[PDB]
Structures are given as C-alpha cells and as structure tokens.
Symmetry: C7
Subunit: 30 residues, 7 copies
C-alpha cells in the first residue's frame, strides 16, 4: 500500500543517513 | 494520498540530512 | 488533513536539521 | 486530534535537535 | 490512545537526542 | 497493537541513537 | 501488517544509525 511504501522510503533514507555517518567516521580516521 | 505524500516529504528531508552529513565528512577531509 | 499537516511539520523540522548540519560543516571549514 | 498533536510534539523535539546542532556549530566557532 | 502514546514516546526519545547533542557541544567548548 | 508496538521499537532505537551520541561526547572529553 | 513491518524497518535503520555513531565515537578515541 501507499502508506507502507512511503514508510519504506523513510527507512531507506535513514540507511543513507547511516552511510553518510560512516563516511564521517572514515574522515576522522584519515 | 495526502498522508502518503506527507511521508514521502519526510523521506526527502531525510535525504537532505544525509547530504548535509556528507558535507561534514568533506569538511573533515579538507 | 491535520495528520498530513503534522507530518509536513515534521518534514520541515527535518530540513532545519539538515541546514544546521551544514552550519556544522561550515564551522569545520573555517 | 491526539495523534496529530503527538506528531506536533515530534516536530517540536526535532526543532530542539536542530538548535542543539547549531550549538555544536557555535562551539566549533 | 496507544498509538498517540507511542508517538509521544518517540518525541521524548528525540528530546533525549537533543540533550546528548548539547552534551557534545559542551565537550567541544572545552 | 502491532502498529503501537512498532512505534515503540522506533522510540527504543532513537534512545540508542541518544546513547551513542553520549559516547561521542565522552570521546571528545578524553 | 505491512504498515507495522515498514515501521519495524524504520527501527532497524535507526539502529544502523546508532551503530554508525558508535564508530564515530571510536574514531574520536
């Protein structure tokens, strides 16, 4: 359903946030 | 649906957060 | 609808968080 | 509605998070 | 209602995130 | 209900985010 | 339910965010 799909898009965007934070982790380690 | 669309706007805003975090990682690199 | 409108407030708030993160990025450059 | 007003409480806490992030930026100068 | 109460729990958890971010700011100050 | 319970899981996850942020603050203090 | 399962996916992504932040803490150590 459309509400379920939109929520899934929210979860995907949150994963993108996790990845960007890992990029920050690596930047600090560099 | 309006609830679905609103949720999709939340997903989009979360993507902007992930981008902002990339700018932070970039500021750290250089 | 009030539920949709409240969700849009949440998206707006998340955008403000994105802009604040960019302020963090800017401060790290400087 | 109780559900809408709870969502508004969520929006308000998110604004508090944005302000805290601004405080971090300020700390960094 | 149980759904509204759960949303209130989310709001409270987010407040805790704000406080932890304030802690980070304090740490950066000195 | 399953929706209320899932929202509570989200609240719990947000609390883990707050704690991780406190870890970041601790690391910054040495 | 599909709505509940999607919200559970949101919870798991948030946990991934908590873990990424832990890695940032470790990096700062």
């Amino acid at each position: 359903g459309e509400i379920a799909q939109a929520l899934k898009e929210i979860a995907k965007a949150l994963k993108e946030i996790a990845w960007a934070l890992k990029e920050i982790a690596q930047a600090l380690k560099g």
